Structures are given as structure tokens and as C-alpha cells.
């Protein structure tokens, strides 16, 4: 097929199935979302340069936006101004640090970026959308009610790519080391290192060190460090936290982007298999059925023990993580720890 052909095929599908979102439609059309979006260029999308160092700070020009980051089973939507942005010297790491938009950006796999200005009945819905080497969405930022609409066009023109294009280059997915079996992991060393952890940020390196998958290490850590929970407990913890006003942290990401909410959750709702947070500045959409394992995890650090809940899919990938709200230098709060431990292990 061609990009003109793809665009047409998609519009035909959406006419048939207006509930279908871009990501769903792309799958039905047997292409990546990135490809689908590129089929839009010259119609209602403009391809931008992948110049993250200029683009990311510039989004701050737009005022309050909505940032959307998801994986297969969980969608995180947070509202606020896109600041404060810092991008590393080597241009491979980005941060957005603020009480609202709070992001960790791993720019290396970021491949293509488009500015979309989509006709609505009456207005136009504008978004910046980023895609990875495989065409899978990385991160999106949506203009909303309160955005500075006049920043839009100058931003697009400044970042507009020379070759507008509608094809999109994609790379074949890169090496998966085969997992070791549990019996091949040095469990004592891993536990020793676990006990020695000084900052929750060092966890990743610890896994790399012993060659263990994250779920695998939890399994081998022992009950004092990690315990499996009934999968249905996660929604219940949200419900209990809603009940008390406890400020929590909710981490949701994919291989290339992590988005964080800090604060309480208040308004919660089920719709079918979806468990939802539905607050004015924060929406969360969790497909509970996609959760294969749920762990309570405890990690030592310089600020003391940090307790979190970590939900995984069938592939061993993290859906969402919960912590208590905390500043580096402060220990976690008792109310959080009490709630996190209140639930019975399997």
C-alpha cells in the first residue's frame, strides 16, 4: 500500500468504527501508529525535526497542556505547563520537573515527531506526537482549553522538517538477550546488593549486574524485600488512598518515556475492565485485566526504606508503579507505608 492509500483506508475504517483510536486503527490496518500519522502529512500533520533540545523547551511556549504517556495497559494523562525542561549535554536524556508535568525522557529511541492540527466540528485539536524506532507512540502533548494557541504556528514553522514526507523510516527491533532461568541467577549476590542499595535510582544497575529480569529479581529477593499480591488489590489501594487523601506517586511509562503524578487521587471509577482516576488535572486509565503480577517491593536507600507496588504484564514489563509522595532527603511517609503494607501477600 501507499501513504495516500493508508490515509484513505484509515478514514474508511474510522467511518465504520468511530470509537477506534489511532493506535487501534493502525493495528487493524496492520501498520504502526507512526506510519499512520505520517500518512497524515500534507493533510493535517506536519513533520517536525527530531531536535529534542530545541523542541522540548519550546513546548513551554504553549502554556498549560495535557501530556499523554502510556504503555499497552495503562494511560497516564497529566495537565500543566511543559516545564521545567532540561536536556543532557549528549542530548540523550530529558527531564521535565514540576509539581504537575513530571517526566523522564529517554531520547535515544525517539525517532519521529509530528505536529497535528486536526479539524473538529468547530475548532481544531492540536498535538505534538512522538514515535519510536518501531513506529510505536512514545509520548504526546495535547493543546487544551488553556493553551496559548498563538504559540502553535511559530513553533511548528521553526521546527518543521525540510523533507515533509509521509513514509517514515523504521528499524528492526533490537536484541533481546534471552532471559536466564531463575537457577542461573546468583541469588545471594543479588540479595546482598539489594540490602546494600543506596538510592532507588540504582536499582536498574543492580539488575543489569546480575543479569536478572525485574520480576525475576522480585521472585528471588525473598519476602522481606518483595511479596506478590492479589492482582485485584491495586484498585483497592487506589480506593483506600482516595478515601484518605494520601498524596501518592504514580509512575507510568514505556521504554522511552516515564510520566509521573504526585499528589492525591480523589475521583475514581470503574468502566468494564478499566479502572480510572478522573480528577481535574490528572486522569489515569488502567486495564486491570492486563495485569499479570502485582508486587509489594521494599528497597533500602540513603533516605531509608522505600516501599512501592509494581504491576507487570505477561511480558514482564511494568504497567504502573506506586510510591508515597516524598522529596529526596525525606523518608517515606508513615501513612503510605501503612497502606502499602496493609494488604495481605499471596
Residue numbers of the site for ligand HEM (CB under 6 A)? 95, 97, 104, 200-201, 203, 251, 258, 299, 301, 306, 308, 323, 326, 328
- Of 67, 62, 257, the C-alpha closest to 159 is 62
CB of 241 to ligand HEM, least distance (A): 16
Least distance between ligand HEM and beta carbon 248 (Å): 11
Grid coordinates given for 174: 533490537
Nearer to ligand HEM, 95 or 117 (CB): 95
Up-side HSE of residue 12: CA atoms within 13 Å toward CB? 8
Nearer to ligand HEM, 48 or 318 (CB): 318
Taking each continuous run of H as one helix and of E as one strand, the counts in the chain are 10, 18
Element of type H or E holding 6: helix 3-16
For ligand HEM, the closer of residues 114 and 323 by Cβ is 323
d(CA 61, CA 102): 17
Query: What is the nearest approach in angstroms of ligand HEM to the Cβ of residue 95?
Result: 6
Distance (Å, rounded) from C-alpha 293 to C-alpha 310?
8
State the minimum distance, in angstroms, from the CB of residue 216 to ligand HEM: 15
| 285 labeled binding residue | no
Least separation, in Å, of the C-beta of 56 and ligand HEM? 14
Lateral strand order in the sheet of 274-278: 45-48, 110-119, 124-132, 137-143, 64-70, 74-81, 282-287, 274-278, 268-271
Cβ 203 to ligand HEM shortest distance, Å: 5
Is 200 annotated for ligand binding?
yes
326 annotated binding-site participant: yes
- In sequence order, the β-bridge partners of residue 118 are 125
Integer Cα distance of 131 and 134 in angstroms: 8
Dihedral angle sign, alpha carbons of residues 10, 11, 12, 17: positive
Q: Which residue is nearest to ligand HEM (CB)?
A: 200
124 is in an annotated binding site: no
Residue 104 annotated as lining a ligand binding site: yes
| Least spacing, CB of residue 86 vs ligand HEM, in Å | 8
> Burial of 276 by CB count in 10 Å (0-12 exposed, 13-18 middle, 19+ buried)?
middle
- The minimum distance between CB 234 and ligand HEM, in angstroms, equals 16
Nearer to ligand HEM, 152 or 251 (CB): 251
- Taking the least distance from each CB to ligand HEM, the nearer of 210 and 299 is 299
Judged by beta carbon, residue 295 or residue 323, the one nearer ligand HEM is: 323
Q: Please check if 269 is assigned to a binding site.
A: no
C-to-N gaps above 2.5 Å in the chain, after residues = none
**Nearest-angstrom CA–CA distance, 286 and 312:** 12
Nearer to ligand HEM, 296 or 299 (CB): 299
Rounded to an integer, what distance in angstroms lies between the CA atom of residue 134 and that of residue 173? 7
Cell numbers 503494607 correspond to 341
Nearer to ligand HEM, 95 or 156 (CB): 95
Q: Which residues are annotated as a binding site for heme b?
A: 104, 200-201, 214, 299, 326
Q: Which residues are annotated as a binding site?
A: 104, 200-201, 214, 299, 326
Amino acid at each position: 500500500h501507499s501513504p495516500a492509500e493508508l490515509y484513505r483506508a484509515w478514514q474508511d475504517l474510522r467511518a465504520e468504527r468511530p470509537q477506534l483510536r489511532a493506535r487501534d486503527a493502525a493495528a487493524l490496518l496492520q501498520v504502526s501508529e507512526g506510519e499512520l500519522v505520517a500518512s497524515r502529512v500534507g493533510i493535517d500533520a506536519v513533520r517536525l525535526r527530531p531536535d529534542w533540545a530545541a523542541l522540548l523547551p519550546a513546548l513551554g511556549e504553549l502554556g498549560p497542556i495535557m501530556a499523554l504517556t502510556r504503555n499497552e495497559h495503562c494511560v497516564h494523562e497529566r495537565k500543566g505547563p511543559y516545564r521545567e525542561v532540561t536536556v543532557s549535554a549528549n542530548g540523550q536524556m530529558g527531564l521535565v520537573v514540576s509539581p504537575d508535568i513530571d517526566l523522564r525522557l529517554f531520547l535515544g529511541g525517539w525517532n519521529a515527531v509530528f505536529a497535528i492540527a486536526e479539524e473538529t466540528a468547530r475548532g481544531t485539536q492540536r498535538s505534538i506526537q512522538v514515535f519510536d524506532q518501531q513506529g510505536v507512540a512514545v509520548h504526546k502533548v495535547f493543546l487544551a482549553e488553556a493553551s496559548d494557541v498563538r504559540a502553535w504556528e511559530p513553533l511548528v514553522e521553526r521546527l518543521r522538517a525540510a523533507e515533509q514526507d509521509a513514509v517514515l523510516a523504521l528499524h528492526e527491533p533490537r536484541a533481546p538477550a534471552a532471559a536466564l532461568v531463575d537457577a542461573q541467577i546468583d541469588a545471594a549476590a543479588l540479595r546482598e546488593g539489594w540490602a546494600a542499595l543506596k538510592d532507588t535510582h540504582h536499582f536498574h544497575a543492580l539488575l543489569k549486574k546480575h543479569g536478572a529480569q525485574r520480576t525475576q529479581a522480585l521472585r528471588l529477593a525473598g519476602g522481606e524485600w518483595a511479596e506478590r499480591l492479589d492482582n485485584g488489590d491495586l484498585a483497592k489501594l487506589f480506593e483506600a488512598a482516595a478515601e484518605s487523601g494520601l498524596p501518592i506517586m504514580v509512575f507510568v511509562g514505556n521504554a522511552h518515556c516515564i510520566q509521573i503524578h504526585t499528589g492525591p487521587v480523589c475521583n475514581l471509577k470503574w468502566l468494564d475492565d478499566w479502572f480510572n482516576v478522573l480528577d481535574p488535572e490528572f486522569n489515569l486509565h488502567l486495564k486491570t485485566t492486563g495485569i499479570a503480577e502485582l508486587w509489594r517491593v521494599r528497597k533500602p536507600s540513603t533516605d531509608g526504606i522505600v516501599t512501592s507496588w509494581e504491576a507487570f504484564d505477561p511480558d514482564g514489563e511494568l504497567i504502573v508503579q506506586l510510591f508515597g509522595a516524598r522529596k529526596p532527603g525525606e523518608p517515606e511517609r508513615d501513612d503510605w507505608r501503612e497502606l502499602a503494607e496493609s494488604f495481605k501477600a499471596l
